[PDB]
Amino acid sequence: NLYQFKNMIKCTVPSRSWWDFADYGCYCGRGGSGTPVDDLDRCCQVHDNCYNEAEKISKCWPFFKTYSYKCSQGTLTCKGGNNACAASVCDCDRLAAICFAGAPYNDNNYNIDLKARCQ
Amino acid sequence: NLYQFKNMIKCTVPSRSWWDFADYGCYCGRGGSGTPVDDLDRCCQVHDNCYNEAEKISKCWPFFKTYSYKCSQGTLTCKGGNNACAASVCDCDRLAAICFAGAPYNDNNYNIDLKARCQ
Amino acid sequence: NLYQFKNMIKCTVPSRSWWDFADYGCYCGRGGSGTPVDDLDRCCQVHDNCYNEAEKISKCWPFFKTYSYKCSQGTLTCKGGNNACAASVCDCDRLAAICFAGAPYNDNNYNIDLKARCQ
């Protein structure tokens, strides 16, 4: 669920606030419309796409779905007892958190004008 | 719930992203403040009002409330086994999805400045 | 949960829409980044901090967590049957609602540019 995604990002990107990723580029916090502004934005687009696949599972609602995972010393693991939806959502979150850690954060892409950038 | 509202909009407006309706005018994604910018915005105001009525049911929390419905060939039906809250929320969503399909989407009303338009 | 926070604000600030507080300053609707714009924004920062403490309880997810409370004649009380998470979240919400009632609302701080104000 949303909180667990936040916590995964805290796990792999402890130096950044959740808020920095919650309104960034055309896709971080969003979906659809536009050319990704940079590589971090592309992480987010990939995450959105991953959630769309997870949503093909009936009643699978990624931001609402609780899953089981562990953050240990900056490493994320999704636990085996997750149901199909939980497992899928957990992996989407994990892969994104890892992607975010590697992508450089561009201050110029925070809280951008969607009309200007994302058509 | 929120996902189900998204899916209803996908049912009746399959050519548009959810994101296009998630920050539009003074009311799509919002409520209160302002004169609706256009007829689509008015759909959203009506939807907000509908949710306010549903919220008169104790512990009825529209964006969180799961309901039962079916999208078939672009037609939405709310199912009979819904509890009072579920039934009300489902109908609010259905009527809005239908409203959105008919209202023309004005690019100039996406992601507008609320201070400029919605006081 | 989020709806209950909204309702608490309705209890102590019945003359204002929820939407007025949902995107105000650097912290109302947000967290991290920036110097609070005014005393109301400081209420919100305090609320965010309070939620961070509540989140130290395992699986305590403030915006998702249902709690028991009563609004009577503009006075909020958190009820005794709340679990640890519910109790903590309820108090965070209560204290914020009270803070919001006392803090003057500055129209110039609604829906501000985060890049301009909150770095």
Ligand SMILES: CN(C)c1ccc(O)c2c1C[C@H]1C[C@H]3[C@H](N(C)C)C(O)=C(C(N)=O)C(=O)[C@@]3(O)C(O)=C1C2=O
């Ligand atoms: C619309 N989408 C399917 C859902 C469904 C259920 C939800 O519970 C939510 C969303 C959207 C997401 C978007 C995310 C996005 N970001 C990842 C932080 C984001 O753009 C914000 C934001 N800062 O506006 C959210 O509202 C957000 O945090 C959020 O609270 C959401 C949320 O609460």
Ligand SMILES: CN(C)c1ccc(O)c2c1C[C@H]1C[C@H]3[C@H](N(C)C)C(O)=C(C(N)=O)C(=O)[C@@]3(O)C(O)=C1C2=O
């Ligand atoms: C405040 N309101 C009562 C609630 C309660 C519970 C929720 O779970 C949520 C809301 C607000 C709604 C607003 C809607 C709005 N829209 C319909 C997409 C919207 O303005 C956004 C947005 N793009 O900022 C959301 O955060 C939003 O999608 C959302 O995620 C919400 C949401 O997650």
Ligand SMILES: CN(C)c1ccc(O)c2c1C[C@H]1C[C@H]3[C@H](N(C)C)C(O)=C(C(N)=O)C(=O)[C@@]3(O)C(O)=C1C2=O
């Ligand atoms: C990210 N944060 C941990 C969560 C977790 C679960 C949630 O269900 C939600 C959030 C963020 C909050 C932010 C709040 C904020 N405000 C208090 C209204 C806010 O900035 C908005 C907004 N207008 O964009 C929300 O999306 C918001 O209403 C919301 O719907 C949230 C929400 O739905």
Ligand SMILES: [Ca+2]
């Ligand atoms: Ca590159």
Ligand SMILES: [Ca+2]
């Ligand atoms: Ca008209």
Ligand SMILES: [Ca+2]
């Ligand atoms: Ca002061």
